[PDB]
Amino acid sequence: ALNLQDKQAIVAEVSEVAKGALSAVVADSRGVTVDKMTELRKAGREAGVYMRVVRNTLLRRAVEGTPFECLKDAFVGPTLIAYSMEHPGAAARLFKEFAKANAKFEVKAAAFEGELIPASQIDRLATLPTYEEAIARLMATMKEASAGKLVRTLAAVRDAKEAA
Amino acid sequence: KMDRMGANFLKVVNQIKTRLGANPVPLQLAIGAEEHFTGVVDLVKMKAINWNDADQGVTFEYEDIPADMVELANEWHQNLIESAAEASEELMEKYLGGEELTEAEIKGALRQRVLNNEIILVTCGSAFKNKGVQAMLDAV
Amino acid sequence: AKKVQAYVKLQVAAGMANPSPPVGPALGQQGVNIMEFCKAFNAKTDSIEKGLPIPVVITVYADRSFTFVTKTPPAAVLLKKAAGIKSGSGKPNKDKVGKISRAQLQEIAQTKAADMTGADIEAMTRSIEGTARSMGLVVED
Amino acid sequence: SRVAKAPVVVPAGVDVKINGQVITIKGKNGELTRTLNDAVEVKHADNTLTFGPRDGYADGWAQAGTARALLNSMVIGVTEGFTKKLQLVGVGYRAAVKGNVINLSLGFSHPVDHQLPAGITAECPTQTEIVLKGADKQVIGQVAADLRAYRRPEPYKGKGVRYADEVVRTKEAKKK
RNA sequence: AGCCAGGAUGUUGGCUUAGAAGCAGCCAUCAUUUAAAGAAAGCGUAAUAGCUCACUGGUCGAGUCGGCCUGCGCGGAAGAU
C-alpha cells in the first residue's frame, strides 16, 4: 500500500542541502558519460561542491513542500544540479571546466542569492566569482576617480613643465 | 576474363600492390567491362584497339583514340612516366627538370625494372572472346 | 582521415615486448615499429621495474609512430605479490591459502594512486581490500 | 488501449470526405487514399477527428484503434511520403527503371520486369539503389515485398534485393 | 510500455585452462566517484573484441502488473466403396 520510502526520504535530504547551498547551477544533459561526471565530482568535493542528477519529480516536490532559494520552480527535461556549501562560487566554476569538453549549451540557468541567472549572463559572473579580487575591482573604479586621477595628472604635467 | 560480369580491372591492380607487395604498372588501360570490354587503350602511344571477329585485331595503328577515358588516362600515363623515371638517378633528374621523353626510352627504362625484378607491368584482355591476346604478346 | 586511433588496450611484461603475441597484428598493420616501440617502452617502465605485468594503452600517429600511457601495474597482481603467495586457491578465502597485512594493502593504494575510484586512500584501500580478499588472502592487522 | 484516442490533428486543410463509414483523404502529395470502416464512428470535429466504437461493441473497439492508425497514416502520406529504400547486394545485380516498370538483372536468364500499380513510382540513384515514392502506405511496402520476393537475401554472403537496410543475421559457410 | 540518454571504476577478481577473457567450469557473490551498473541475465570472434540486460534520469501523463480459484473454448486429433 505505497510502502516505498526512497522517494519520500530523498526529497527531504536534497531540500536541506539545496536550501543550505550558496550558489547553484541548473543544466540539462541527456547524452552524459560516466567519465566526465566522475572527474568533476572528484574535484568538486575538495571545493565543497556536490554535483547531482536527481528526479524532476523529486525536485518539483522539494519546491512544493518548502520555499526554495535555488529555484523559482523546476525546469522541463532532465535536470542536473551543481551546488556548493563552502566556497560560494564553486558550483558554476565546474560548468566552465565542463563546457570546454563535451557540451556547453547544456546550462539553462544558475541561481545567485536566489535570483535566476540565464545562460548568457552567468558566463561573465562565474568567470570571476572570488570576492577579494572583486572588491579590488569595485574599489579600482572609485579609487581612479577619488585620488588616482589627480596624482597621475600632476606627474604628467610636471614632466611637461621641466621639459620646456 | 573482363567480358564476365563483376569484373573491374583497377581493384585487381590495387590487390597486387596491397597483398602481394609489388607495384603494378598498368601498361594498358581498359575500355569497358562486361559487354563493353570491346576495346583497350595502349598507354605507350595513347591509342586504343578494337577486335570484331579475330581479324580486326590484325589492324594495329590509330584504330581508335581513348575517347572519354581521358581524365583517368592522364594520371596513369603520368604513372607510366613516373615508373620509367626511377630506374636511375639520370632519368629521374630529366623528369624533375621539366623535359619530355619517348616510347623507345619508356620501353628501355621499364624493361630494366621488369628484368631486375623491381616493377610488374600489368596488361589485360579476355582470352575467350578473342580480345587483346595479340596485344598481350607484344608486351611479352 | 589520418591513420590515428587512441587508447588501444595492451598488457605485456614491462620493457621486453618484441614478438607477435606481445605486439599483435595491429603494430604491423598500423605501420608501427616494434624496435622503436621497445626503446620508448623501456623509458617509462624502468622506474616501476621491468619484468612486471604492465598495463599500457597505445595512441597511434599516422607518421608510423606511437605514444603510450601506463595505468601502472594491476592492483590484483600487486597485492598478490606484496603478500608473497604464489597463486590463489580454487576455493579462495573460503578455503584460503595465505595472508596479507593492512600495511601491505595501503602500499598497493599508493602505487595505484590516482587510478583508484575511491574517495581517499582509506576508501581506495577499502576497494583493494575486496580484491585482496577475492584472491584468497586472509587479512592480518 | 491508449492509441484509439490519438485524434489526428489535420495539418494544413487536408480534404476530408466523410460518408459515415467510408473516408477519402484528398490533397496534394498523398492524394486520393480511401478506407471503409464499419463498426466505428468517425466524427470530423475541429480538425481533430473523433474515433470510437459504434454502439459500445466488444469487437468494435479493436477496429477503432485500426481506424485511427489508417487515418494518422494518410496524414503522414500527404505530409512526408513513404518507404523509399530498396537496394541490391553483391556481384552483378543491377537494375534500371523504365517508366513505371523496373527491369532488374537479378541473375535470372531473363532480366525481370516488374510493373508498378497506379499510385506509385520509382527511380534509381545508380543501378544498385532503388527509391520508391507513393501515395498509400500499404501499397508502397507491398511493392517492396513483391520485389523482395524475386530474391530473398541469401544468408552466407547476404546477396539479394534488400528492402530497407537490415534484413538478415548472416552466417558462416563451412564454419566448425 | 515505447522513444531518447547513461549503462561505469579496482578489474582481463581468484583459481583452473591452449584460451578462461562479465558471460566452459569451480570459489569468492565484494568494494568504489554514483543519480546508477549483478566481479553479470542472454546472444556473441566456441573465449580477446562487439550487441542487448535488469538498474538510472528525461520525453510520457494513466491506471498498471504478477499469482490463484473457476465456467466455456482451443490445439494435441492420421485409414480402407
Side-chain angles (χ1 to χ4, degrees):
Chain A
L2 189 50
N3 289 87
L4 294 171
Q5 176 60 241
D6 76 297
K7 66 195 221 173
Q8 333 292 340
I10 208 161
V11 176
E13 173 62 0
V14 168
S15 302
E16 197 150 294
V17 302
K19 195 67 173 181
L22 304 177
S23 315
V25 184
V26 198
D28 187 302
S29 203
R30 56 165 74 165
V32 68
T33 61
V34 196
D35 292 88
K36 299 303 179 188
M37 184 50 63
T38 297
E39 299 178 299
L40 188 81
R41 205 122 66 184
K42 182 210 293 284
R45 74 204 178 89
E46 178 178 286
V49 197
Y50 256 100
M51 168 53 132
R52 275 183 170 169
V53 169
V54 291
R55 292 207 71 167
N56 283 292
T57 68
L58 177 169
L59 280 182
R60 301 149 194 169
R61 215 73 178 73
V63 179
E64 200 181 15
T66 46
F68 248 48
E69 181 181 353
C70 291
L71 277 169
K72 187 172 184 180
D73 191 1
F75 306 141
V76 306
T79 304
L80 277 65
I81 180 59
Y83 68 96
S84 186
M85 307 295 290
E86 188 175 282
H87 163 39
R93 314 191 72 207
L94 271 56
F95 196 77
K96 294 279 277 172
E97 299 185 67
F98 190 18
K100 302 183 173 183
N102 192 78
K104 64 205 297 181
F105 301 115
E106 300 210 308
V107 68
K108 293 194 174 88
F112 177 57
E113 307 189 68
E115 187 167 64
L116 300 172
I117 312 298
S120 296
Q121 283 64 48
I122 190 60
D123 187 57
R124 296 291 190 167
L125 184 66
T127 295
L128 293 171
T130 313
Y131 198 38
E132 307 307 298
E133 294 163 63
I135 296 162
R137 289 274 293 154
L138 292 163
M139 189 187 190
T141 56
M142 193 182 180
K143 177 165 61 173
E144 199 260 354
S146 300
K149 183 75 164 186
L150 188 65
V151 306
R152 295 166 181 159
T153 297
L154 301 172
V157 170
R158 186 180 170 205
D159 181 61
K161 181 62 70 67
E162 285 279 63
Chain B
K1 314 213 191 188
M2 314 223 299
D3 58 303
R4 181 174 168 171
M5 293 191 196
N8 281 119
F9 179 16
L10 305 175
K11 70 91 57 58
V12 186
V13 170
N14 199 45
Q15 301 323 275
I16 298 161
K17 183 187 296 180
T18 45
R19 309 178 189 194
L20 301 182
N23 176 51
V25 182
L27 171 59
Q28 292 175 260
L29 189 70
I31 296 176
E34 53 199 60
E35 278 66 61
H36 315 299
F37 191 64
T38 194
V40 301
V41 193
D42 170 75
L43 287 191
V44 187
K45 297 289 182 168
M46 201 66 96
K47 76 183 181 66
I49 315 174
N50 39 52
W51 283 261
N52 291 357
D53 203 299
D55 300 306
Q56 177 65 5
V58 185
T59 305
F60 226 69
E61 194 175 70
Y62 290 108
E63 315 88 293
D64 203 4
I65 62 166
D68 54 285
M69 295 294 139
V70 56
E71 60 182 66
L72 296 91
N74 296 332
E75 70 177 75
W76 274 298
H77 197 94
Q78 192 205 54
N79 194 347
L80 185 69
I81 302 295
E82 187 185 354
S83 186
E86 303 166 305
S88 187
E89 53 267 51
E90 305 187 3
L91 289 154
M92 195 159 55
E93 180 78 62
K94 193 169 193 67
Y95 170 48
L96 187 48
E99 304 204 308
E100 307 185 307
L101 196 54
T102 63
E103 48 271 75
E105 202 57 51
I106 287 164
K107 295 180 174 216
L110 286 176
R111 191 181 198 252
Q112 308 313 296
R113 301 191 78 173
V114 189
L115 264 42
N116 279 283
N117 294 263
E118 313 291 349
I119 240 69
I120 176 172
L121 321 182
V122 187
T123 59
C124 51
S126 292
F128 189 51
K129 297 300 180 184
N130 314 307
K131 302 294 177 276
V133 192
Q134 300 77 59
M136 182 224 82
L137 284 179
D138 178 68
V140 177
Chain C
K2 299 192 185 298
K3 294 280 190 174
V4 299
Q5 191 168 111
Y7 293 97
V8 182
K9 173 187 174 185
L10 186 71
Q11 181 175 114
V12 286
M16 313 88 178
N18 300 288
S20 303
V23 304
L27 291 205
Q29 198 291 125
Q30 296 183 124
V32 207
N33 193 297
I34 72 296
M35 303 179 291
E36 314 302 64
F37 197 100
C38 188
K39 289 179 183 289
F41 197 40
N42 278 252
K44 292 184 182 291
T45 62
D46 192 79
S47 54
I48 31 176
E49 303 170 68
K50 302 185 301 302
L52 299 188
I54 243 296
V56 41
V57 305
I58 56 172
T59 297
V60 182
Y61 303 131
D63 282 60
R64 296 198 173 201
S65 193
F66 43 81
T67 197
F68 75 100
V69 173
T70 61
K71 199 211 72 181
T72 61
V77 177
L78 292 162
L79 290 159
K80 194 165 69 191
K81 185 72 278 308
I85 72 170
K86 296 184 180 295
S87 67
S89 187
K91 295 174 287 291
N93 202 250
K94 205 283 289 174
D95 278 301
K96 69 278 196 297
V97 279
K99 186 182 289 292
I100 196 162
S101 185
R102 295 286 291 182
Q104 295 174 328
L105 300 183
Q106 66 179 98
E107 212 67 58
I108 285 76
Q110 63 171 250
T111 299
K112 297 299 298 189
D115 303 292
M116 311 179 89
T117 172
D120 78 302
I121 66 96
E122 202 166 64
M124 298 163 176
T125 298
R126 186 164 64 233
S127 315
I128 56 178
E129 171 187 295
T131 304
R133 183 182 67 240
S134 218
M135 61 179 65
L137 292 162
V138 188
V139 189
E140 203 62 63
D141 304 302
Chain D
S1 185
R2 260 61 63 184
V3 298
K5 309 181 290 181
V8 193
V9 190
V10 179
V14 192
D15 194 3
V16 186
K17 183 64 173 68
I18 187 67
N19 213 122
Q21 64 310 103
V22 176
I23 310 184
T24 310
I25 267 55
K26 180 176 186 179
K28 56 89 65 177
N29 187 40
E31 53 285 285
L32 298 171
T33 310
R34 173 180 276 208
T35 188
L36 190 160
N37 318 129
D38 187 59
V40 294
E41 298 170 357
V42 189
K43 312 188 178 183
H44 183 85
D46 303 297
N47 298 303
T48 309
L49 290 62
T50 290
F51 300 110
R54 199 165 295 209
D55 300 292
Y57 297 164
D59 305 275
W61 174 222
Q63 182 169 120
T66 326
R68 185 284 304 149
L70 303 180
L71 273 284
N72 291 189
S73 189
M74 297 154 194
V75 164
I76 292 187
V78 307
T79 302
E80 193 174 5
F82 291 126
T83 190
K84 299 269 183 171
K85 195 60 62 180
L86 263 69
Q87 69 196 296
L88 291 78
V89 184
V91 307
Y93 278 177
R94 57 90 186 278
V97 189
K98 175 63 174 176
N100 59 86
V101 190
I102 310 168
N103 191 238
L104 308 90
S105 298
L106 284 175
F108 297 121
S109 186
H110 45 276
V112 281
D113 59 285
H114 186 72
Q115 58 82 200
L116 292 173
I120 180 173
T121 50
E123 42 275 302
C124 56
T126 187
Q127 293 184 337
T128 53
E129 289 195 66
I130 315 298
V131 163
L132 282 140
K133 67 191 188 301
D136 180 52
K137 196 176 177 181
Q138 200 264 257
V139 163
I140 189 159
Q142 188 58 208
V143 159
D146 197 296
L147 283 164
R148 170 258 182 171
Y150 290 116
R151 296 287 190 184
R152 301 181 72 195
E154 201 69 72
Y156 300 107
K157 205 189 299 183
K159 185 166 185 178
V161 51
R162 187 174 294 209
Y163 70 158
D165 294 70
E166 183 61 300
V167 73
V168 78
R169 306 204 311 169
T170 307
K171 63 186 181 184
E172 187 49 75
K174 298 306 303 174
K175 207 183 77 176
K176 54 178 182 187

mmCIF file of all heavy atoms in Angstrom, chain B residues 123-139:
data_model
loop_
_atom_site.group_PDB
_atom_site.id
_atom_site.type_symbol
_atom_site.label_atom_id
_atom_site.label_comp_id
_atom_site.label_asym_id
_atom_site.label_seq_id
_atom_site.Cartn_x
_atom_site.Cartn_y
_atom_site.Cartn_z
ATOM 1 N N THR B 123 48.983 -6.064 -67.917
ATOM 2 C CA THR B 123 48.327 -5.991 -69.209
ATOM 3 C C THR B 123 46.977 -6.629 -69.054
ATOM 4 O O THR B 123 46.662 -7.157 -67.991
ATOM 5 C CB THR B 123 49.088 -6.694 -70.313
ATOM 6 O OG1 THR B 123 49.301 -8.076 -70.053
ATOM 7 C CG2 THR B 123 50.453 -6.019 -70.474
ATOM 8 N N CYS B 124 46.104 -6.580 -70.061
ATOM 9 C CA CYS B 124 44.741 -7.019 -69.887
ATOM 10 C C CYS B 124 44.136 -7.499 -71.184
ATOM 11 O O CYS B 124 44.479 -7.056 -72.278
ATOM 12 C CB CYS B 124 43.858 -5.892 -69.298
ATOM 13 S SG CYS B 124 43.991 -4.313 -70.207
ATOM 14 N N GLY B 125 43.192 -8.439 -71.105
ATOM 15 C CA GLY B 125 42.484 -8.898 -72.278
ATOM 16 C C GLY B 125 41.802 -10.194 -72.007
ATOM 17 O O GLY B 125 42.415 -11.149 -71.548
ATOM 18 N N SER B 126 40.496 -10.286 -72.299
ATOM 19 C CA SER B 126 39.785 -11.543 -72.274
ATOM 20 C C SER B 126 40.239 -12.460 -73.352
ATOM 21 O O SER B 126 40.071 -12.178 -74.534
ATOM 22 C CB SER B 126 38.283 -11.400 -72.537
ATOM 23 O OG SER B 126 37.672 -10.732 -71.451
ATOM 24 N N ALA B 127 40.790 -13.614 -72.982
ATOM 25 C CA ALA B 127 41.144 -14.617 -73.941
ATOM 26 C C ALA B 127 39.948 -15.223 -74.640
ATOM 27 O O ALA B 127 39.929 -15.335 -75.860
ATOM 28 C CB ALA B 127 41.959 -15.719 -73.258
ATOM 29 N N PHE B 128 38.882 -15.598 -73.912
ATOM 30 C CA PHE B 128 37.809 -16.370 -74.506
ATOM 31 C C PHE B 128 37.099 -15.662 -75.623
ATOM 32 O O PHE B 128 36.775 -16.264 -76.640
ATOM 33 C CB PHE B 128 36.787 -16.856 -73.465
ATOM 34 C CG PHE B 128 35.770 -17.836 -73.992
ATOM 35 C CD1 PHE B 128 36.151 -18.976 -74.712
ATOM 36 C CD2 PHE B 128 34.411 -17.651 -73.708
ATOM 37 C CE1 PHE B 128 35.201 -19.908 -75.142
ATOM 38 C CE2 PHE B 128 33.456 -18.580 -74.127
ATOM 39 C CZ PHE B 128 33.854 -19.711 -74.842
ATOM 40 N N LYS B 129 36.883 -14.348 -75.520
ATOM 41 C CA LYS B 129 36.193 -13.663 -76.592
ATOM 42 C C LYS B 129 37.145 -13.139 -77.641
ATOM 43 O O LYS B 129 36.743 -12.370 -78.511
ATOM 44 C CB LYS B 129 35.311 -12.533 -76.032
ATOM 45 C CG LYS B 129 34.193 -13.053 -75.113
ATOM 46 C CD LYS B 129 33.221 -14.017 -75.817
ATOM 47 C CE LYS B 129 32.120 -14.529 -74.885
ATOM 48 N NZ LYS B 129 31.286 -15.526 -75.592
ATOM 49 N N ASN B 130 38.427 -13.564 -77.612
ATOM 50 C CA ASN B 130 39.447 -13.197 -78.575
ATOM 51 C C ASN B 130 39.670 -11.705 -78.628
ATOM 52 O O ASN B 130 39.503 -11.054 -79.661
ATOM 53 C CB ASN B 130 39.188 -13.747 -79.984
ATOM 54 C CG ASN B 130 38.811 -15.207 -79.853
ATOM 55 O OD1 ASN B 130 39.518 -16.004 -79.231
ATOM 56 N ND2 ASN B 130 37.652 -15.586 -80.440
ATOM 57 N N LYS B 131 40.008 -11.141 -77.464
ATOM 58 C CA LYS B 131 40.275 -9.747 -77.287
ATOM 59 C C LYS B 131 41.655 -9.658 -76.710
ATOM 60 O O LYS B 131 41.941 -10.261 -75.687
ATOM 61 C CB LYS B 131 39.282 -9.147 -76.271
ATOM 62 C CG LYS B 131 37.804 -9.319 -76.656
ATOM 63 C CD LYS B 131 37.426 -8.525 -77.919
ATOM 64 C CE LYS B 131 35.978 -8.712 -78.409
ATOM 65 N NZ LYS B 131 35.832 -9.924 -79.259
ATOM 66 N N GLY B 132 42.578 -8.918 -77.340
ATOM 67 C CA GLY B 132 43.805 -8.484 -76.670
ATOM 68 C C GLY B 132 44.925 -9.472 -76.504
ATOM 69 O O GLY B 132 45.983 -9.136 -75.985
ATOM 70 N N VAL B 133 44.786 -10.715 -76.957
ATOM 71 C CA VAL B 133 45.835 -11.714 -76.825
ATOM 72 C C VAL B 133 47.083 -11.340 -77.615
ATOM 73 O O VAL B 133 48.228 -11.453 -77.182
ATOM 74 C CB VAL B 133 45.347 -13.109 -77.132
ATOM 75 C CG1 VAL B 133 46.413 -14.126 -76.683
ATOM 76 C CG2 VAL B 133 44.038 -13.347 -76.359
ATOM 77 N N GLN B 134 46.884 -10.838 -78.835
ATOM 78 C CA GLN B 134 47.954 -10.382 -79.690
ATOM 79 C C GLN B 134 48.661 -9.168 -79.096
ATOM 80 O O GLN B 134 49.887 -9.084 -79.046
ATOM 81 C CB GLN B 134 47.376 -10.028 -81.080
ATOM 82 C CG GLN B 134 46.686 -11.213 -81.808
ATOM 83 C CD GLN B 134 45.290 -11.532 -81.260
ATOM 84 O OE1 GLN B 134 44.387 -10.691 -81.252
ATOM 85 N NE2 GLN B 134 45.103 -12.771 -80.749
ATOM 86 N N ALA B 135 47.886 -8.225 -78.536
ATOM 87 C CA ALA B 135 48.413 -7.128 -77.754
ATOM 88 C C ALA B 135 49.222 -7.590 -76.526
ATOM 89 O O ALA B 135 50.325 -7.114 -76.235
ATOM 90 C CB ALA B 135 47.271 -6.187 -77.355
ATOM 91 N N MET B 136 48.705 -8.587 -75.791
ATOM 92 C CA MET B 136 49.397 -9.198 -74.684
ATOM 93 C C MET B 136 50.762 -9.752 -75.103
ATOM 94 O O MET B 136 51.775 -9.469 -74.467
ATOM 95 C CB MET B 136 48.527 -10.319 -74.089
ATOM 96 C CG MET B 136 49.138 -11.032 -72.869
ATOM 97 S SD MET B 136 48.969 -12.841 -72.893
ATOM 98 C CE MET B 136 50.385 -13.106 -73.980
ATOM 99 N N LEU B 137 50.856 -10.469 -76.236
ATOM 100 C CA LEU B 137 52.120 -10.987 -76.736
ATOM 101 C C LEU B 137 53.142 -9.887 -77.003
ATOM 102 O O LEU B 137 54.334 -10.034 -76.722
ATOM 103 C CB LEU B 137 51.978 -11.856 -78.013
ATOM 104 C CG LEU B 137 51.434 -13.287 -77.819
ATOM 105 C CD1 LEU B 137 51.328 -14.002 -79.173
ATOM 106 C CD2 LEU B 137 52.327 -14.113 -76.891
ATOM 107 N N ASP B 138 52.703 -8.730 -77.523
ATOM 108 C CA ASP B 138 53.579 -7.645 -77.914
ATOM 109 C C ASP B 138 54.347 -7.141 -76.686
ATOM 110 O O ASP B 138 55.578 -6.994 -76.682
ATOM 111 C CB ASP B 138 52.654 -6.543 -78.502
ATOM 112 C CG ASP B 138 53.398 -5.294 -78.917
ATOM 113 O OD1 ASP B 138 54.180 -5.344 -79.895
ATOM 114 O OD2 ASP B 138 53.187 -4.230 -78.280
ATOM 115 N N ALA B 139 53.630 -7.019 -75.563
ATOM 116 C CA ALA B 139 54.254 -6.700 -74.310
ATOM 117 C C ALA B 139 55.282 -7.746 -73.834
ATOM 118 O O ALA B 139 56.293 -7.384 -73.227
ATOM 119 C CB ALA B 139 53.162 -6.512 -73.243
#
